Every structure is written in C-alpha cells, then in structure tokens.
C-alpha cells in the first residue's frame, strides 16, 4: 500500500470474535517509519531535541 | 557502538551446532551505512553484510555451513549458526561491526 492511497486507511470490519487489535506503533516521531514523513515529522527532522505533548486526531 | 561481551570462551561438542552471539546497541551519532564482518585465525573473512545483501562464499573449509540467524540484522543481531562442528574449527572468531562513526570488535574463542 506504500505506492497508493491505501496507506492512509485503517480497515475496520465487523469482526466475529471480540477484543482484537486495530493497529499499533511506537511513538518516535523522527525515528519510526510511520510518523516520519508527516508534517510534524518533517519539522522534527531539522532539529535534534523536542518536548511537549502530541495530539492524535482520529476520524 | 558497543558489543555486550567483547571476549568469552565457548565450549561445545562435535556434531553439534555452535551459536556465536554478536549483539549491539546504537548510539545516536551512528547514521552511516551498516557493515558486518566475521574473521577466523586458527584473518580470513567467512561472511559479509554490506549494502543489504549477503555474500557468504569466502572460506573453502566452511563452504555452505555458516549462516546468519535473525531476519532483523539492523536491530542489533549479528549472531551466526555454525552447523556440523568439526575438530579443525579451533580459532578465535572476530565479529567486526562498523556503522560510521562507530566501530567495535568481539573476539570469540571457540574450543571443542
């Protein structure tokens, strides 16, 4: 899905069993390869230290 | 760059499979390309890892008997599995890792 628009979608289906996982990733906003090329991640890859909190808007 | 134990002694028996570990961590300055060697002195290279592709036909006595173990070599795994140990496998093995600007060694003494 990397060379497509499918990389932004999380598939959520009507599951049969309960308590399953949807996704997951570590929170390293300059080191992980999911938060790397975002708009926040291409500002942090000009600096070295960072601080503060992060919002994660879902929809 | 730093290896966990830069020298030890490993004692195994003939016909078994040796497990020579080589693990490391990553200091924040290390940003270059990866490089992993292995040596023997019963100074001949026995395996390589550079440019994401493995080259492993180097020692004639150990032809097709040594392999890497993990699938995640850029996470701190450089262990090799020596299959079918013989009496003539006596010598110090040297795990040379070089991710710039770091370099480390590990002299593994293997006696069966």
């Amino acid at each position: 899905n990397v060379s497509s628009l499918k990389a932004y979608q999380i598939p959520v289906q009507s599951n049969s069993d309960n308590g399953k996982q949807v996704f997951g990733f570590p929170l390293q906003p300059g080191a992980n390869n999911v938060l790397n090329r975002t708009l926040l991640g291409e500002i942090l890859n000009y600096y070295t230290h960072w601080s503060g909190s992060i919002k994660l808007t879902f929809m | 760059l730093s290896i966990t134990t830069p020298e030890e002694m490993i004692e195994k028996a003939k016909g078994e499979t040796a497990y020579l570990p080589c693990k490391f961590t990553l200091s924040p300055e290390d940003q270059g390309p990866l490089d992993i060697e292995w040596l023997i002195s019963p100074d001949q290279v026995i395996i390589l890892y550079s440019g994401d592709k493995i080259y492993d036909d180097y020692y004639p006595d150990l032809k097709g008997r040594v392999h890497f173990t993990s699938n995640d070599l850029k996470s701190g795994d450089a262990s090799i599995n020596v299959t079918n140990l013989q009496l003539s496998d006596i010598g110090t093995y040297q795990c040379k890792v070089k991710k710039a600007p770091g370099v480390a060694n590990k002299k593994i003494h293997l006696v069966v």
Binding site: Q9, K20, S51 | -
Partner: protein, 58 residues
C-alpha cells in the same frame, strides 16, 4: 533519532465492541488518523536533514 534511553512507549487501538451494521450496507468501514502538536511544543539544536541526497549539480 532512534535511541533506547528516551523511548516514548507505544500507542495502540482496540475494539471495545463490534461494528454493528444494518442490512444492505457494506461492512468494512475505514478510519483516518491525524497528528499534530499541542500549544506547548518546542525544539532545539538545528541540524541538517537526512532525507535528501545529491551527487551532481543540476
């Protein structure tokens, strides 16, 4: 950069209940996810990026 001393944990997401759905509706709904900084974000120690290489002049 990827360090082990100052790692920041993990973010997961779990089903609480199922996704129920009426008749003649598709099942596989999709979810988007954004990211942003708060009002108290800050940076330091300007360096050069690792994302753009070069080998000649254009």
């Amino acid at each position: 950069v990827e360090d082990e001393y100052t790692a920041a944990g993990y973010v997961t997401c779990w089903y609480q209940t199922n996704i129920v759905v009426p008749a003649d509706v598709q099942s596989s709904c999709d979810i988007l996810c954004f990211v942003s900084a708060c009002n108290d974000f800050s940076v330091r120690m300007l360096k050069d990026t690792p994302f753009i290489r070069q080998d000649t002049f254009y």
